[PDB]
């Protein structure tokens, strides 16, 4: 922590809401397409602090759809996925 001894220091900001949307997009393609495009709806709702939070939505969305055996990823699936994740984060960070 003498300066120019570690010659570069790099901070990564906490993600932007646009930055978030790009992460959300690509993992959804791996699953099945979000019907009625609700990829935006998540980003409008909250900005994550990390890419892990984003991943958590994905896994969960695909989990309600799994149970059902209906590959479709519906608005109903996304809405559950988000709130469930959102609670969890708050109960650690209070």
């Amino acid at each position: 922590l003498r300066p120019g001894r570690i010659d570069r220091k790099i901070e990564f900001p906490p993600p932007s809401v646009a930055a978030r949307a790009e992460i959300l997009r690509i993992h959804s393609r791996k699953m099945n397409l979000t019907r009625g495009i609700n990829l935006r709806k998540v980003a409008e709702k909250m900005n994550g602090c990390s890419g892990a939070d984003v991943k958590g939505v994905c896994t969960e969305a695909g989990m309600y759809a799994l149970r059902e055996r209906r590959i479709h990823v519906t608005q109903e699936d996304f809405e559950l996925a988000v709130g469930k994740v959102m609670n969890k984060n708050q109960e650690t960070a209070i």
Binding site: M31, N32, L33, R69, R70, I71, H72
Partner: protein, 381 residues
Amino acid sequence: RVPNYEVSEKAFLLTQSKVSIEQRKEAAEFVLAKIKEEEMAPYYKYLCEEYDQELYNELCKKNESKIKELNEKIQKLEEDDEGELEQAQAWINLGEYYAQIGDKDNAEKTLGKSLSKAISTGAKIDVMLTIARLGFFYNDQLYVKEKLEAVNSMIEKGGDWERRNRYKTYYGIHCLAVRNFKEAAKLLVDSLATFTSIELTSYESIATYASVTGLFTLERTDLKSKVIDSPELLSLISTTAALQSISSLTISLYASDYASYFPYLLETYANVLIPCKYLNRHADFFVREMRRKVYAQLLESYKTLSLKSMASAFGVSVAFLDNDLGKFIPNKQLNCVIDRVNGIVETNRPDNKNAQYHLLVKQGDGLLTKLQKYGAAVRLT
């Protein structure tokens, strides 16, 4: 795209004289308006024999209107700057019209140009499928087959999950179309679970097909789980007539009603197997199996039966039953004989040691011939 199948299915009932004259002419009323409306003369020429020149002036007008519209539209959108995408969409649009009049020849051309141009990867997969749809319209089995390979070539490169759902249903129809039902029953019931429809034949069709194919292929225990206790089929109830007839035949077999079983076979043949174009081919093939099945179960349960007990349960006479039984016995799926003299039906049903011996030795003969075949050539060389 959508109407092309609607027409032909109606037209089929008009074609056949097997159908009742009342039903025939119901179909005649319905189809006639749409011939004129969707301008269906190239396809209609075949069927008309097979069962106005205004239709044509209309064709040619339409041909030219629709033909010209679309032509100069592209001439417009070559100019207007976006060389990959807007020509592509305009070329698709020519093909939309071709597909409308049921001329597949001209469809292929315009959608060819569409493909050349490099556009959205999803879009291409949609086009390939549309060409495979035209194989169902003509109901040429050979047309559907070749095309569905091109679709399967691009699906997994595309890694589209969405149009991957469509693949199932289309490939259902190829295996349905063909005799071999072993691949068909699996495919068509999976598509009741996941339906994605973008310009696609009704959901009703899928129900009708699952039920038949369920019956033919599956054993007793798996029939209950997958067909009888299907939630979709039950939730949709029996609404349509075609669906209704097959449902009654299914319940009775499982509830082991024997009296109404044989009347439902007659019913199913009148109202399910013959209206369908794809399972018209397999009407004979389906029934022969199902009559063997009621018996095959019954003989499992009984060392001996009388002729009168066997016959009477079903509601057919002793003379009729005896005759039907000698037809089925040399295929060796019933493994029983009829003692004329004692009047009993004795059941051989061998699952002895000697039985299992036969099955492995027939596999070994197949391997024996091949060894000789490869060896003898290669030694001479």
